[PDB]
Model the fold of this input.
Amino acid sequence: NFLVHSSNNFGAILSSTNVGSNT
Amino acid sequence: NFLVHSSNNFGAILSSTNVGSNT
Amino acid sequence: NFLVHSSNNFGAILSSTNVGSNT
Amino acid sequence: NFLVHSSNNFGAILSSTNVGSNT
Amino acid sequence: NFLVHSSNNFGAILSSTNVGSNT
Amino acid sequence: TCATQRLANFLVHSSNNFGAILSSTNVGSNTY
Amino acid sequence: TCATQRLANFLVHSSNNFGAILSSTNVGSNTY
Amino acid sequence: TCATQRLANFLVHSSNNFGAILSSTNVGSNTY
Amino acid sequence: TCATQRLANFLVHSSNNFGAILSSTNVGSNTY
Amino acid sequence: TCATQRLANFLVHSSNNFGAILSSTNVGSNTY
Done:
């Protein structure tokens, strides 16, 4: 399909539900 | 399908539900 | 399907439910 | 299916439920 | 199915329930 | 890269949070 | 990379959190 | 990589947390 | 890699936590 | 890799934790 590669960065995620791609 | 490789980084995740891809 | 390899990093995860991919 | 290999790292996980992939 | 090999690392896990994959 | 702490105090209070509350105080320590 | 702590005190209080509360105070120690 | 602690005190209090509370104070010790 | 501790004191208190509380103070000791 | 401790004291108190409380103080000793 669309062949993703994030190569992202973060931090101090809190009380969320989803952090990242989905299919 | 879409063949992902994150290569991400984070820290100080707390009280979340999901951190990463999903299918 | 979509053949993931994370290669991620983190730390100081606390009181969460899920940290990583899911199928 | 989607053939994952994490190669991740962390530490100071505490009072969570799940840390890793799931099927 | 999806043939995982973690190769992860951590430490100072405390009072959690699950640390690792599940099926 | 010059960095140093010499601080006296700090207080925190919260009755019953539903969410979370951080308190970070570090020096020079890069965090991934 | 110059970094050092010389600090006197700090206090924390919370009745009953539902969530979490960090308190980080480190020097030069890169954290993954 | 210059890093060192010379600190006097610090206090923590919490009645009954539901969650967690860290307290990190380390020097130069990279943590994975 | 320069790192060393010369510190006097530190205190901790908590009535009845439901969760956990760390207290890390190490030097140069990489932790996996 | 320069690392050494020369520290005087430190205290800990907690009434009845439900969870856990670490206290790490080591030098140069990599921990897996």
